[PDB]
């Protein structure tokens, strides 16, 4: 089949900035390749068609060119509306492809997150299960690294994470971690904490509880 | 000037089947291509196959063949979409879309339709409070549910600054844990009630929780 890479896989800018998003086939698809555009919860939504064509009622500031491996698509100045992920698509071979997704996010100033731990309520443990909750609160960039810590010791296999769209008011991430194991596993242990790194952070910041 | 107007969400179990349709309202349905195409939770799109109705001619991709069979109805202009011998990694938002042969393009898409896979059974969520400290931070985790959504609101939704409801998380279970926060100010914690509501629509489950320190 014929395999689509876009790139960056990420952009950040700000509104009323140029984008510049690029899409590489494998081979040549001539002029027979499409962008979309796609938000949470909604189906994509056609910008460009063989290859620098717009679909009816798409916006003057979306625009595309290339031909044959390589590929554009240019947003002259980003609107609020245009932060989301596209994909490039082509048809000039079966089966039909997509791109892996660009996603254009809004840059802002490095914020540092606001760090909250959560025990497990007695009314769960009730149930024979201990989860333990991380919040990460408005922080930019989005990577973080959460770390959990048990009496000390690094915890691994155990915990699974969550991270909320870049918020439009304030354009910053939150990001949710759950540890859990079982009620005797959680009793026979004191300290649990959660260990955060960020680059709004000057060191690590750790927050814990004694059951 | 075309509608493509898919059916409801599906839950099925591994090794089973599922049939979807898309019904179109308006332009041509006979001089069209009908595609459907899928997508995982957060990843990315894939085409499935398609079929141009009035010669009743469908094509697949090859990971897919023997899988997927993709019929039409010109008579109700419906299109329909059936995966047989489901798994876990089948679990995705389906949708289909119009193909235009001239240029290689989808214009028309249609809702889409999500089909979770699973050996799960729908299963209401338990709702666990998760207390602020002694700007403060509470919220609720709503554990163990089955399947996807589930909503979260605070005070009736009359509170909506500050929240954050973070996407779900498949645990190994097979069954679905989210949580939902919100930051207040510490003032109000003395008097301001707190409560989480959670709905639960594929199990016409409605559960609130006050949340105190």
């Known amino acids: 089949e014929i395999v689509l890479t876009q790139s960056p896989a990420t952009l950040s800018l700000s509104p009323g900035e140029r984008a510049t998003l690029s899409c590489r086939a494998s081979?040549?698809?001539?002029?027979?390749l499409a962008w979309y555009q796609q938000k949470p919860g909604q189906a994509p939504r056609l910008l460009i068609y063989?290859?620098?064509n717009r679909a009816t009622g798409i916006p003057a500031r979306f625009s595309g060119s290339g031909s044959g491996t390589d590929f554009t698509l240019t947003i002259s100045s980003l609107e609020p509306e245009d932060f989301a992920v596209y994909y490039c698509?082509?048809?000039?071979?079966?089966?039909?492809?997509f791109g892996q997704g660009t996603k254009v996010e809004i840059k802002r100033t490095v914020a540092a997150p606001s760090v909250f731990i959560f025990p497990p309520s007695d009314e769960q443990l009730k149930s024979g299960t201990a989860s333990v909750v991380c919040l990460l609160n408005n922080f930019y960039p989005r990577e973080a690294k959460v770390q959990w810590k048990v009496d000390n010791a690094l915890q691994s296999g155990n915990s699974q994470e969550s991270v909320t769209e870049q918020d439009s008011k304030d354009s910053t991430y939150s990001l949710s971690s759950t540890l859990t194991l079982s009620k005797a596993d959680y009793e026979k242990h004191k300290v649990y904490a959660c260990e955060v790194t960020h680059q709004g952070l000057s060191s690590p910041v750790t927050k814990s509880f004694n059951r | 000037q075309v509608q493509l107007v898919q059916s409801g969400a599906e839950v099925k179990k591994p090794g089973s089947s599922v049939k979807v349709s898309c019904k179109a309202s308006?332009?041509?349905?006979?001089?069209?291509?009908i595609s459907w195409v899928r997508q995982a939770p957060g990843q990315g799109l894939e085409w499935m196959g398609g079929?141009?109705?009035?010669?009743?001619?469908?094509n697949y991709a090859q990971k897919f063949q023997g899988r997927v069979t993709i019929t039409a109805d010109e008579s109700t202009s419906t299109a329909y979409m059936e995966l047989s011998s489901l798994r876990s990694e089948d679990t995705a938002v389906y949708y289909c879309?119009?193909?235009?042969?001239?240029?290689?393009?989808?214009?028309?898409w249609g809702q889409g339709t999500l089909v979770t896979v699973s050996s799960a059974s729908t299963k209401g969520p338990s709702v666990f409070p998760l207390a602020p400290s002694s700007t403060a931070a509470l919220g609720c985790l709503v554990k163990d549910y089955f399947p996807e959504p589930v909503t979260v609101s605070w005070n009736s939704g009359a509170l909506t600054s500050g929240v954050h409801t973070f996407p779900a998380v498949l645990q190994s279970s097979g069954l679905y844990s989210l949580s939902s926060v919100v930051t207040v100010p510490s003032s109000s914690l003395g008097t301001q009630t707190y409560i989480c509501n959670v709905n639960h629509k594929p199990s016409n489950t409605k559960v609130d929780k006050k949340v105190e320190p």
């Open positions: 079929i141009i109705p009035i010669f009743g001619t469908a």
């Open positions: 698509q082509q048809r000039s071979n079966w089966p039909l492809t």
């Open positions: 063989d290859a620098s």
């Open positions: 308006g332009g041509t349905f006979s001089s069209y291509a």
């Open positions: 081979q040549s698809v001539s002029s027979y």
């Open positions: 879309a119009r193909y235009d042969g001239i240029y290689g393009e989808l214009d028309f």
